[PDB]
Amino acid sequence: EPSLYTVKAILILDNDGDRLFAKYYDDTYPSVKEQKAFEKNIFNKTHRTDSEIALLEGLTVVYKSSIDLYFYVIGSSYENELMLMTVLNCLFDSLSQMLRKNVEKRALLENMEGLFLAVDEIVDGGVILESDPQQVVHRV
Amino acid sequence: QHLEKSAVLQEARVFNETPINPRKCAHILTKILYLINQGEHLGTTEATEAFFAMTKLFQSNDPTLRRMCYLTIKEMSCIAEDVIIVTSSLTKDMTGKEDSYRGPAVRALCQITDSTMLQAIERYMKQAIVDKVPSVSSSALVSSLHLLKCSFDVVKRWVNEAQEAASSDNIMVQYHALGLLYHVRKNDRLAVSKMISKFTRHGLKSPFAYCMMIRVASRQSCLRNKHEMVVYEAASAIVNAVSVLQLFCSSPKAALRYAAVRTL
Amino acid sequence: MRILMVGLDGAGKTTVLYKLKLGEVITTIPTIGFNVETVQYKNISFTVWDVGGQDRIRSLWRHYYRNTEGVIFVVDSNDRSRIGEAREVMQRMLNEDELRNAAWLVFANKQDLPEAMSAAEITEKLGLHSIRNRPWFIQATCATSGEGLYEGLEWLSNS
Ligand SMILES: Nc1nc2c(ncn2[C@@H]2O[C@H](COP(=O)(O)OP(=O)(O)NP(=O)(O)O)[C@@H](O)[C@H]2O)c(=O)[nH]1
Ligand SMILES: [Mg+2]
């Protein structure tokens, strides 16, 4: 069944798979406990890897990395991988252009405002709002 | 960096003071957002106090502070009481002169608005849906989508402004527009078929719209699309006198091959 | 100077505020919320919080009490049915500890209407004479003309 609701969650995890940023856009992982459990789970699977795609917990996980950071877009296994991929790219490019710099735990914590606002420009309640990194950077 | 809830809720009490420091106060808002993102539970009472402190920041004309306020409003919308207090400020900002604030304001407004109060803002919603600024238009469309849950009968009425927006050259706007239309028309089979017939000729210019529309078509054709995403979508659709070549041809590539192979 | 302007719905609070800020008579909608604006009068910058008067919002004014130096209470002088209700709201407002020393300025408004109660009449109905603990003043106003508005800002500034 078709929907504007595609993105299940967006995560940014540090080297310890601890939470730098998270949004969960539906009821799959209801409480923080099981959310953090999920995040550890997917970090343990994806740490130090380039494979930019994974099936975990019955969900498509799309991901990529920088020095100390991991970026994840998660959606249903029934979604289109390339659309999730446009979300992940948007988020990472946007954050780059924003920071004018390599995107890493230090830099990112330097501006949290920017991050919050940017993620907010990218996904609205599970819906993809803007896929274009430049548009997003402009809106901050 | 790493901090305590009570401290931050405390320094939030500086918002009640008149000579407002935009930089400082916005930093504190950021601390609050972070506490919340981290998963920290705030109680109804302390949340409500912080909310009502944040409202007082609406006196400041600092843009970054305003934006942080919109965020804060959306994030505390469900944990704080009487968030309706911001309705006027947001209708103002949303109808205001400055486009940077308009889309975000719509989003926040619709977040704190409940099916009882929906009637008060309907006019402004219809206006924002047809705006020429894609930020605004898109924000209002997705907003309406969300509002389809609590109140369906009010939003169905907006199909006209929606349709107007579905002609947009902007690919996001078109996407949200047709998306919203489907979300309303879904379940009235006739209106869906009409919907489909309409864009089968003079199709769309949005890849995302293309994808979702293909998915729409799949309920009980053309892979010449110049976007990878649509071609794939089409393909996976078709396989549920076939031509499964393009999948195989996708099989050779970076990270697209997962989608291909995963099928079957 | 920090000012809280309240009163029942339709008293004319926003009309007053934007007359003062824009010299213009705007077309209001009911305020579900507040408007906050800064107005310059004679070297004072008044920050005015106009807080909507319908019931849901009325329940929220107490969050705007703290830090208030002066209170503008707007009354629709033409509405006789709701004057008692105004009296009731204002009386317990007078009991609020955060409002304890704030200057109390009543605007008897829509004075332009033929049957508007007089300011003296309103003073009797609101029980204004019985306030001995702080400064009060009543002023006949018409927010559309602008009549009495600056006489109000004047009185207020002399707190
Ligand atoms: N005749 C007359 N009408 C007035 C006067 N002041 C305001 N009005 C009108 O009476 C209505 C009151 O509007 P408004 O100022 O929005 O009332 P309010 O106190 O802001 N109400 P709310 O709390 O619901 O926003 C409007 O129609 C307004 O134009 C006045 O001095 N005379
Ligand atoms: Mg008002």
Beta pairing partners, C151: none
- Which strand ranges, in their side-by-side order, compose the sheet holding C2-7? C34-41, C44-51, C2-7, C70-76, C103-109, C136-140
Instruction: Give helix B63-76 / helix A112-122 axis angle, nearest 10°.
Output: 60
**Which residues have C-beta under 5 Å from ligand 2, the single-atom ion?**
C 13-14, 31, 52
The rounded distance, in Å, linking the Cα atoms of B160 and B162 is 5
Give the closest-approach CA distance of C96 to chain B in angstroms.
17
Asked if residues B133 and B166 have their Cβ atoms less than 8 Å apart, the reply is no
Domain spans in chain B, listed from the N-terminal domain onward = 1-264
Continuous segment of H or E residues that includes residue C73: strand C70-76
Indicate which of C4, C14, C18, C34 best probes the interface with B, i.e. most B CBs within 10 Å of its own CB: C34
The residues facing A69 across adjacent strands are: none
Q: What is the DSSP letter of A53?
A: E
Question: How far are the Cα atoms of B173, B187, B197, B230, C86 from residue B191, in angstroms, in the given order?
Answer: 21, 9, 10, 24, 53
Whole-number Å distance, alpha carbon B104 to ligand 1 midpoint, is 30
Tell me which residue has tokens 């705006």. B131
Q: Which residue has the tokens 């790493």?
A: B2
A117, B10, B15 from A112: Cα distances, Å: 9, 20, 20
Element (H, E) at C109: strand C103-109
Domain count along chain A: 1
Please give the tally of structural domains in chain C. 1
**Cα–Cα distance measured from residue B26 to residue B66, given in angstroms and rounded to the nearest whole number:** 9
| Closest residue by Cα to residue A3 from B108, B145, B191 | B145
* Residue-range definition of the domain harbouring residue C54: 1-159
C and A touch per CB criterion (3+ pairs under 8 A): no
Can C139 be counted among the known catalytic residues? Answer: no
- Cα B113 versus chain centre, distance: 14
B30, B174, B199, B230: best to mutate for the A interface, most A CBs within 10 A: B30
Cα–Cα distance measured from residue C24 to residue B104, given in angstroms and rounded to the nearest whole number? 29
Find the discontinuities in chain C where C to next N exceeds 2.5 angstroms and give the residue preceding each: none
Catalytic residue among C40, C54, C91, C139: C54
Candidates A19, A83, A140; nearest CB to B208: A83
CATH code of the domain in which C44 resides: 3.40.50.300
Domain range for residue A23?
1-140
Tokens of A139: 């809106």
Report whether residue C72 contacts ligand 1, using a CB cutoff of 6 Å. no
Minimum distance, in Å, between the CA of residue A83 and any CA atom of chain B: 7
CA distance, residue C130 to nearest chain B CA (Å):
31
Q: Record the tokens describing residue B27, joined without a space.
A: 């930093």
Show the tokens assigned to C3.
């000012």
Q: If you search the block for the tokens 């920041």, which residue do you land on? A: B57
- The class level of CATH for B1-264 reads mainly alpha
* Residue A124 DSSP one-character state: E
- The count of CB pairs under 8 A between chains B and C is 42
Q: A24 CA to chain B: closest CA distance, Å?
A: 10
Residue at token pair 């735990």 = A105
Q: Which ligand is nearest to the CA of C50?
A: 2
Question: What distance lies between CA B84 and its chain's CA centroid?
Answer: 20
Q: Closest partner residue to B88 among C31, C59, C66, by Cβ?
A: C31
Cβ neighbours of residue B62 under 8 Å, at least 6 residues apart? B22, B26
Per the CB < 8 Å rule, is B87 touching C33? yes
Query: Is the CB of C15 inside a 6 Å radius of any atom of ligand 1?
Result: yes
Beta-carbon neighbour count of residue A12 at 10 Å?
23
Structure tokens at A101: 């710099």
CA torsion angle B77 B83 B88 B91 (round to 10): 10
∠ CA C42-C62-B65, rounded to 5°: 65
Residue A139's CATH number:
3.30.450.60
Q: Which residues pair with B137 in a beta bridge?
A: none
Task: Confirm or deny that C143 is annotated as ligand binding.
Answer: yes
Chains within contact range of chain A (3+ C-beta pairs < 8 Å):
B
Question: Do chains B and C touch by CB distance (3+ pairs < 8 Å)?
Answer: yes
- CB proximity B98 to A under 8 Å: no
C-alpha distances in angstroms, B246 versus A85, B155, B232?
20, 40, 8
Q: Any CB–CB contact under 8 A between B98 and chain C? A: no
Decide whether any atom of ligand 1 lies within 6 Å of the C89 Cβ. Answer: no
Torsion angle of C-alpha atoms C15, C18, C19, C23, degrees rounded to 10? -150
CB within 8 Å of chain A, chain B residues 118-147: 135, 138-139, 142-143, 145-146
Dihedral of CA atoms B41, B46, B49, B53 in degrees, nearest 10, equals -60
Kindly identify which residue of chain A lies nearest to residue B74, measuring between CA atoms.
A120
